Design an enzyme around this catalytic site. Structure first.
Site, PDB file in Angstrom:
ATOM      1  N   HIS A 196      -2.627  -4.990   1.834  1.00  0.00           N
ATOM      2  CA  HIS A 196      -3.957  -4.793   2.408  1.00  0.00           C
ATOM      3  C   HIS A 196      -3.959  -4.396   3.883  1.00  0.00           C
ATOM      4  CE1 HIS A 196      -8.185  -4.753   2.102  1.00  0.00           C
ATOM      5  NE2 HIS A 196      -8.446  -5.938   2.622  1.00  0.00           N
ATOM      6  N   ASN A 222      -8.419  -2.684  -3.102  1.00  0.00           N
ATOM      7  CA  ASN A 222      -9.805  -2.400  -2.745  1.00  0.00           C
ATOM      8  C   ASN A 222     -10.114  -0.909  -2.763  1.00  0.00           C
ATOM      9  OD1 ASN A 222      -8.143  -2.158  -0.337  1.00  0.00           O
ATOM     10  ND2 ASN A 222     -10.056  -1.960   0.821  1.00  0.00           N
ATOM     11  N   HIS A 223      -9.100  -0.054  -2.662  1.00  0.00           N
ATOM     12  CA  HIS A 223      -9.313   1.383  -2.770  1.00  0.00           C
ATOM     13  C   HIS A 223      -9.301   1.871  -4.211  1.00  0.00           C
ATOM     14  CE1 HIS A 223      -9.224   2.834   1.486  1.00  0.00           C
ATOM     15  NE2 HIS A 223      -8.743   1.615   1.660  1.00  0.00           N
ATOM     16  N   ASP A 280      -3.867  -0.132  -3.835  1.00  0.00           N
ATOM     17  CA  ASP A 280      -4.101   0.903  -2.827  1.00  0.00           C
ATOM     18  C   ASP A 280      -3.135   2.078  -3.020  1.00  0.00           C
ATOM     19  OD1 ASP A 280      -6.170  -0.571  -1.825  1.00  0.00           O
ATOM     20  OD2 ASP A 280      -5.417  -0.658   0.236  1.00  0.00           O
ATOM     21  N   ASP A 340      -6.420   7.391  -1.566  1.00  0.00           N
ATOM     22  CA  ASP A 340      -7.107   7.453  -0.274  1.00  0.00           C
ATOM     23  C   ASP A 340      -6.138   7.553   0.900  1.00  0.00           C
ATOM     24  OD1 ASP A 340      -9.573   7.348  -1.512  1.00  0.00           O
ATOM     25  OD2 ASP A 340      -9.853   5.198  -1.168  1.00  0.00           O
ATOM     26  N   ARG A 341      -6.651   8.016   2.045  1.00  0.00           N
ATOM     27  CA  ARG A 341      -5.936   8.096   3.319  1.00  0.00           C
ATOM     28  C   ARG A 341      -4.840   9.158   3.320  1.00  0.00           C
ATOM     29  NH1 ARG A 341      -9.183   6.862   7.242  1.00  0.00           N
ATOM     30  NH2 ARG A 341      -9.974   4.712   7.129  1.00  0.00           N
ATOM     31  N   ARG A 370     -13.701  -6.021   8.518  1.00  0.00           N
ATOM     32  CA  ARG A 370     -13.967  -4.896   7.629  1.00  0.00           C
ATOM     33  C   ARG A 370     -15.440  -4.789   7.256  1.00  0.00           C
ATOM     34  NH1 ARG A 370      -8.829  -3.476   5.319  1.00  0.00           N
ATOM     35  NH2 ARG A 370      -7.244  -5.069   5.781  1.00  0.00           N
ATOM     36  N   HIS A 387      -3.812  -8.314  -3.996  1.00  0.00           N
ATOM     37  CA  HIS A 387      -3.884  -7.268  -2.981  1.00  0.00           C
ATOM     38  C   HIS A 387      -4.361  -7.824  -1.644  1.00  0.00           C
ATOM     39  CE1 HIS A 387      -4.256  -3.293  -1.247  1.00  0.00           C
ATOM     40  NE2 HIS A 387      -5.480  -3.607  -0.862  1.00  0.00           N
ATOM     41  N   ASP A 420       0.822  -1.205   0.000  1.00  0.00           N
ATOM     42  CA  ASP A 420       0.000   0.000   0.000  1.00  0.00           C
ATOM     43  C   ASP A 420       0.859   1.258   0.000  1.00  0.00           C
ATOM     44  OD1 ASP A 420      -1.727  -2.118   0.514  1.00  0.00           O
ATOM     45  OD2 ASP A 420      -3.024  -0.927   1.824  1.00  0.00           O
ATOM     46  N   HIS A 446      -1.136   4.594  -0.631  1.00  0.00           N
ATOM     47  CA  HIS A 446      -2.167   5.467  -0.070  1.00  0.00           C
ATOM     48  C   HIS A 446      -1.752   6.936  -0.124  1.00  0.00           C
ATOM     49  CE1 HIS A 446      -5.240   2.662   1.055  1.00  0.00           C
ATOM     50  NE2 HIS A 446      -4.425   1.939   1.802  1.00  0.00           N
TER      51      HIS A 446
HETATM   52  C1  BKM Z   1     -15.918  -1.709  -4.586  1.00  0.00           C
HETATM   53  C2  BKM Z   1     -16.989  -1.217  -3.971  1.00  0.00           C
HETATM   54  C3  BKM Z   1     -17.651  -2.065  -2.869  1.00  0.00           C
HETATM   55  C4  BKM Z   1     -17.026  -2.185  -1.691  1.00  0.00           C
HETATM   56  C5  BKM Z   1     -17.637  -3.047  -0.568  1.00  0.00           C
HETATM   57  O1  BKM Z   1     -17.499  -4.223  -0.634  1.00  0.00           O
HETATM   58  C6  BKM Z   1     -18.419  -2.407   0.616  1.00  0.00           C
HETATM   59  C7  BKM Z   1     -18.563  -3.358   1.816  1.00  0.00           C
HETATM   60  C8  BKM Z   1     -19.634  -4.412   1.541  1.00  0.00           C
HETATM   61  C9  BKM Z   1     -18.991  -2.567   3.063  1.00  0.00           C
HETATM   62  C10 BKM Z   1     -18.026  -1.432   3.442  1.00  0.00           C
HETATM   63  C11 BKM Z   1     -18.645  -0.645   4.589  1.00  0.00           C
HETATM   64  C12 BKM Z   1     -16.674  -2.007   3.898  1.00  0.00           C
HETATM   65  C13 BKM Z   1     -15.634  -0.883   4.213  1.00  0.00           C
HETATM   66  C14 BKM Z   1     -14.473  -1.374   5.115  1.00  0.00           C
HETATM   67  O2  BKM Z   1     -14.970  -1.699   6.373  1.00  0.00           O
HETATM   68  C15 BKM Z   1     -13.416  -0.280   5.269  1.00  0.00           C
HETATM   69  C16 BKM Z   1     -12.867   0.122   3.897  1.00  0.00           C
HETATM   70  C17 BKM Z   1     -12.257  -0.806   6.132  1.00  0.00           C
HETATM   71  O3  BKM Z   1     -11.662  -1.780   5.799  1.00  0.00           O
HETATM   72  C18 BKM Z   1     -11.864  -0.054   7.440  1.00  0.00           C
HETATM   73  C19 BKM Z   1     -10.765  -0.774   8.255  1.00  0.00           C
HETATM   74  O4  BKM Z   1     -10.243   0.113   9.192  1.00  0.00           O
HETATM   75  C20 BKM Z   1     -11.344  -1.996   8.979  1.00  0.00           C
HETATM   76  C21 BKM Z   1     -12.629  -1.602   9.724  1.00  0.00           C
HETATM   77  C22 BKM Z   1     -10.308  -2.540   9.965  1.00  0.00           C
HETATM   78  C23 BKM Z   1     -10.962  -3.545  10.924  1.00  0.00           C
HETATM   79  O5  BKM Z   1      -9.289  -3.189   9.251  1.00  0.00           O
HETATM   80  C24 BKM Z   1      -7.986  -2.697   9.518  1.00  0.00           C
HETATM   81  O6  BKM Z   1      -7.730  -2.231  10.581  1.00  0.00           O
HETATM   82  C25 BKM Z   1      -6.896  -2.769   8.417  1.00  0.00           C
HETATM   83  C26 BKM Z   1      -5.997  -1.525   8.430  1.00  0.00           C
HETATM   84  O7  BKM Z   1      -4.825  -1.788   7.727  1.00  0.00           O
HETATM   85  C27 BKM Z   1      -6.732  -0.352   7.764  1.00  0.00           C
HETATM   86  C28 BKM Z   1      -7.251  -0.518   6.326  1.00  0.00           C
HETATM   87  O8  BKM Z   1      -8.453  -0.274   6.029  1.00  0.00           O
HETATM   88  O9  BKM Z   1      -6.454  -0.914   5.431  1.00  0.00           O
HETATM   89  C29 BKM Z   1      -6.897   0.800   8.433  1.00  0.00           C
HETATM   90  C30 BKM Z   1      -6.363   0.935   9.873  1.00  0.00           C
HETATM   91  C31 BKM Z   1      -7.630   1.984   7.790  1.00  0.00           C
HETATM   92  O10 BKM Z   1      -8.824   2.218   8.127  1.00  0.00           O
HETATM   93  O11 BKM Z   1      -7.055   2.717   6.939  1.00  0.00           O
HETATM   94  C32 BKM Z   1     -19.003  -2.771  -3.134  1.00  0.00           C
HETATM   95  C33 BKM Z   1     -20.235  -1.971  -2.652  1.00  0.00           C
HETATM   96 MN    MN Z   2      -6.450  -2.638   0.835  1.00  0.00          MN
HETATM   97 MN    MN Z   3      -4.740  -0.131   2.155  1.00  0.00          MN
END
Ligand code: BKM
Ligand code: MN
Ligand code: MN
Ligand code: CL
Ligand code: CL
Ligand code: CL
Length: 293
Positions: free
Chosen positions: A242, A118-119, A86, A89-90, A215, A167, A58, A60
């Site tokens: 990721h 995914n971003h 990725d 974003d961020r 997530r 990814h 990543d 970002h």
């Molecule tokens: C392509 C379009 C599409 C996407 C989807 O599938 C939507 C899905 C069904 C629902 C959404 C709400 C999911 C979004 C995630 O929850 C977000 C993007 C996420 O991953 C936040 C992350 O902080 C989660 C909650 C966390 C538990 O994981 C981590 O801590 C990993 C960490 O490395 C991280 C990251 O996201 O990479 C952090 C700390 C960050 O927030 O930047 C179809 C509609």
């Molecule tokens: Mn990712």
């Molecule tokens: Mn990422």
């Protein structure tokens, strides 16, 4: 398309205080998207690459950390590169980041490779920064142009038939590599299925088989899922990104999977390092690291 002028303006801020912008023109960025889009479609969605090469996780939008990575590993085409996604974003400078990567992809289409994270899905980067950056510094019409370009990115790569790169991670629907090659482009990222899992799933040491993902999408998978997958497909390693990790790289399941994260001090909150993996001619892996502040 004055590719060298575009690249020259992007590398010009080397040595400056981080944060200084490179504002390309609207037409130059549109040309980068359309031309790189053609190259993505002309190349397979499942890339087959050869070592030696460098693999990054990543970014970002941490543009000056991307510049540090090229300073450590050699600016293209001095080294072959594979990025795992990725790019936006961020961070603060997603525009400078993706523009340099697209420019290098156009100039060196067979020595520079970018995977989809995914971003690089419109529904995600609409919320997590890239849309606001496009709206502020350009316009939302250009953001859609980026989106059309992201819809053609490859999703996985195999290095010398031994290292499987994506990814996110593995999928419960992944039985044959031909399932990936059948995915047609351009395409959006669905909220479930193989393409979703390859961009979203995570390994977990406290899970047996397939579990739920914090997530809110896709799954988690355990160490035995990795071992059986490697044995079935005659592979040595799974290389993914990721997840932010403290050392920038993190092995899993007896060094059968490695996680790469190349953005140090991740979005100001974490004290993580950024790592870039070097694969030599014998597929031996070493690391170059951006240590945290
Ligand atoms: C392509 C379009 C599409 C996407 C989807 O599938 C939507 C899905 C069904 C629902 C959404 C709400 C999911 C979004 C995630 O929850 C977000 C993007 C996420 O991953 C936040 C992350 O902080 C989660 C909650 C966390 C538990 O994981 C981590 O801590 C990993 C960490 O490395 C991280 C990251 O996201 O990479 C952090 C700390 C960050 O927030 O930047 C179809 C509609
Ligand atoms: Mn990712
Ligand atoms: Mn990422
Ligand atoms: Cl397991
Ligand atoms: Cl180093
Ligand atoms: Cl040091």
């Amino acid at each position: 398309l004055n590719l060298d002028s575009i690249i020259g303006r992007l590398l010009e801020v080397q040595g400056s205080r981080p944060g200084k912008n490179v504002q390309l023109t609207e037409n130059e960025i549109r040309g980068l998207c359309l031309k790189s889009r053609e190259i993505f479609l002309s190349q397979p969605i499942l890339l087959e690459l050869e070592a030696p090469l460098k693999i990054c996780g990543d970014i970002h939008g941490q543009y000056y950390d991307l510049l540090r990575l090229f300073e450590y590993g050699g600016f293209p085409p001095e080294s072959n590169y594979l990025f795992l996604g990725d790019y936006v974003d961020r961070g603060k400078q997603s525009l400078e980041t993706i523009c340099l990567l697209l420019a290098y992809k156009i100039k060196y289409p067979e020595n520079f490779f970018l995977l989809r994270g995914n971003h690089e899905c419109a529904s995600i980067n609409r919320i997590y920064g890239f849309y606001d950056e496009c709206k502020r510094r350009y316009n939302i019409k250009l953001w859609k142009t980026f989106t059309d370009c992201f819809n053609c990115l490859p999703i996985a790569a195999i290095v010398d038939e031994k290292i499987f790169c994506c990814h996110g991670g593995l999928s419960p629907d992944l039985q044959s590599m031909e399932q990936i090659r059948r995915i047609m482009r351009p395409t959006d990222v669905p909220d479930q299925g193989l393409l979703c899992d390859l961009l979203w799933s995570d390994p977990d040491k406290d899970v047996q088989g397939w579990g739920e993902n914090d997530r809110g999408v896709s799954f988690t998978f355990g160490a035995e899922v990795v071992a059986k997958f490697l044995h079935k497909h005659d592979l040595d390693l799974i290389c993914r990104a990721h997840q932010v990790v403290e050392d920038g790289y993190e092995f899993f399941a007896k060094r059968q999977l490695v996680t790469l994260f190349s953005a140090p001090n991740y979005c100001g909150e974490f004290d993580n390092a950024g790592a870039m993996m070097s694969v030599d001619e014998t597929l031996m892996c070493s690391f170059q690291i951006l240590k945290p502040a």
